[PDB]
Design a protein around this ligand. Structure first.
Ligand SMILES: Cc1ncc(COP(=O)(O)O)c(CN[C@@H]2CONC2=O)c1O
Ligand SMILES: Cc1ncc(COP(=O)(O)O)c(CN[C@@H]2CONC2=O)c1O
Ligand SMILES: [Cl-]
Lengths: 380, 382
């Protein structure tokens, strides 16, 4: 690549899960590789993680997990975002743990297990307060009654019971101890109606890094696997011992001199104060560069951190080097490692008024990924 | 048909939009701009649709997007302008692609390339008339203009056109507009006198095309308007401008349940139910292209009524408050589509997320499948 590409370090990835493994000594690890691994490459990161000690693999959509098996990845895998008509049968045949939050899901899977002549491994999801997916406390008895019954009929096998936190990245939030308590009480009742789960889990990356009383048998870690801290309130990847996996770089396409008082970019939302040097970065919002980052986004050009000049276009944006010099083809680092003096996904989150989760995840397809580290077959 | 979420592209809306646009610049050619996967609509399918409908030129930003079009079997004139040292000059020249030169480093590369390729490269000179983005500054025109006419004589290149791009065309009656138009006539002319005979002179994008007839010249570069979306509300709705929206984003509810009064919804708990009600889970989040920034305002059409994103929008989904109404898993929700059909539109979302329509349709995820209608059967094979 010469215009813009993403450099993924697989050694950073492996070291992260080894760090996270130590953080929860008595628990099992679940590397979440959903959404193309938050933009780093689903399969490469799935193999690296697993190699480093990942016992489970989790994704959102059935398609995402199927594609994981398609690439010959063994071990326990699980998905949780189903919609009526999903590929229940296919998932069951590949021995993937599908999740259930309602009777409709349970009924769809039970019928699929029949056609497949096999038993689906299912995990019941408790809605302990997030109010997103999962079963409400008011319908827990009912759904729990059906599982054990569908279990007796040998059609399904309840392998686990799980929930998910709403403000776990906000240390001290009252909503946290609530859900955690509601989790225990819901688990008891189900464990009493004839359910012996293979795994018990509720924690995510922030919960994992903060509350041990929430580790149980398994922990589902996503973002931290990529060396990005869930929130500033928890620390920088550096303080967390996490190492950034992606480095986004580009080459300048033009460097010119313009008189003082010259407008730059759409809407001329930036006017040159004095005759200066204007560089051109060939990466716009279609490549994943937030347009709300207009005027703030940091770029590492010529030994100094520069700022987005004016509006950010679909394909490119300009930067004012001032007195400094540079030429077409030169390297620019839009986001990378804080330990290398470069900008980070957090820096851009703040610049764009969003979160580090969005920054990395929304990095386009038009942008090639280049792998380094891990083993050779990982780079596929 | 997709079970989670998907996008349907109406190829007839595309075919009709260009036929409308041409009738606006009667004495100028039309270059359809399908860069960025046709602003999220599917590059090859739309490129074919627009050609057959009347586009004489195709425009993409990068050489790769241009080499993909050729690789897909598309003929006719094509041009790309975003280049960096080491680009596929040779490959681009062999495939007969009009490229843009704004600096000398480019000229020397295409020259070395036209040499290896044993062919003459058709180049177009970009002039920076105010945008301050790309193109030659007025103070380096003669230098570039000179070296060019020199490359001509050597038989390496061939200057096929002189152009430029506006900064505030989409802002009706902006001072920058006239100022930029003026520089064009002066910079262009000089190039003529010094020898250059251009095949085409262009400067108009969608807004300028729709508003200023004196910006047409030989060619006109229209991107957004071709897909039925209007550059700016300050120009009207696709309806008034006489345009038909081409994209329709639909998803299927995954869950619908009842929750007690005072329950929190999503991360941070930014939304609390004022009473006992029905909540519905839409399985699509910011990884599919839904702006997280539209959290709490993004309009969706669910069960006969427009609902607002209840709380924080997530990576893979978000919830909507059905209130008293009822619905179920599998029922379809329309995120964005045709206002004429009483559906939320790209502008609606553009406003909700505090941005411009251009970015909404352009950033629709790749995890999101595309389904084509109308047009010619063979148009949706690649
Ligand atoms: C159920 C579940 N568990 C674990 C994770 C991993 O979380 P971290 O990345 O914070 O470690 C996620 C991802 N959460 C997102 C965020 O938005 N939509 C989701 O599915 C999740 O949804
Ligand atoms: C150089 C160039 N020509 C023509 C067009 C087509 O313009 P319309 O889409 O308005 O018809 C664009 C706009 N492309 C975008 C839009 O925003 N930033 C860009 O680079 C462009 O960049
Ligand atoms: Cl130069």
């Amino acid at each position: 690549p010469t215009r813009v590409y993403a450099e993924i370090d697989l050694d950073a990835v492996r070291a992260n899960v080894r760090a996270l493994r130590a953080r929860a000594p008595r628990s099992a690890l679940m590397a979440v590789v959903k959404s193309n691994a938050y933009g780093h490459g689903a399969v490469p990161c799935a193999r690296a993680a697993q190699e480093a000690g990942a016992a489970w693999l989790g994704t959102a959509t059935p398609e995402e997990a199927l594609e994981l098996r398609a690439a010959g990845i063994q071990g326990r895998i699980m998905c949780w975002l189903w919609t009526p008509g999903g590929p229940w049968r296919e998932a069951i045949e590949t021995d993937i743990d599908v999740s259930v939050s309602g009777m409709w899901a349970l009924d769809e899977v039970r019928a699929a297990a029949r056609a497949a002549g096999r038993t689906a491994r299912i995990q019941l999801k408790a809605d302990t307060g997030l109010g997103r997916n999962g079963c409400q406390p008011a319908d827990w008895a009912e759904l729990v009654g059906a599982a054990v019954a569908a279990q007796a009929e040998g059609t399904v096998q309840v392998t686990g019971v799980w929930s998910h936190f709403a403000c776990a990245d906000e240390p001290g939030h009252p909503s946290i101890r609530l859900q955690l308590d509601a989790f225990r009480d819901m688990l008891a009742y189900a464990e009493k109606e004839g359910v012996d789960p293979e795994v018990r889990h509720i924690a995510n990356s922030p919960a994992t890094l903060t509350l041990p009383e929430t580790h149980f048998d398994l922990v589902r870690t996503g973002l931290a696997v990529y060396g990005v801290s869930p929130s500033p309130e928890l620390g920088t990847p550096a303080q967390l011992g996490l190492r950034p996996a992606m480095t986004l770089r580009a080459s300048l396409a033009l460097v010119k001199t313009v008189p003082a008082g010259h407008g730059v970019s759409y809407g001329h939302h930036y006017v040159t104060e004095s005759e200066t040097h204007l560089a051109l970065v060939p990466a716009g919002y279609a490549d994943g560069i937030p347009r709300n980052a207009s005027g703030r986004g940091p770029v590492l050009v010529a030994g100094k951190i520069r700022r987005a000049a004016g509006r950010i276009a679909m394909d490119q944006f300009v930067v004012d080097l001032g007195e400094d010099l540079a030429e077409a083809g030169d390297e620019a680092v839009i986001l990378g490692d804080a330990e290398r003096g470069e900008p980070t996904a957090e820096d851009w989150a703040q610049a764009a008024h969003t979160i580090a989760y969005e920054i990395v995840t929304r990095i386009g397809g038009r942008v090639p990924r280049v792998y380094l580290g891990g083993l050779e077959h990982h780079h596929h």
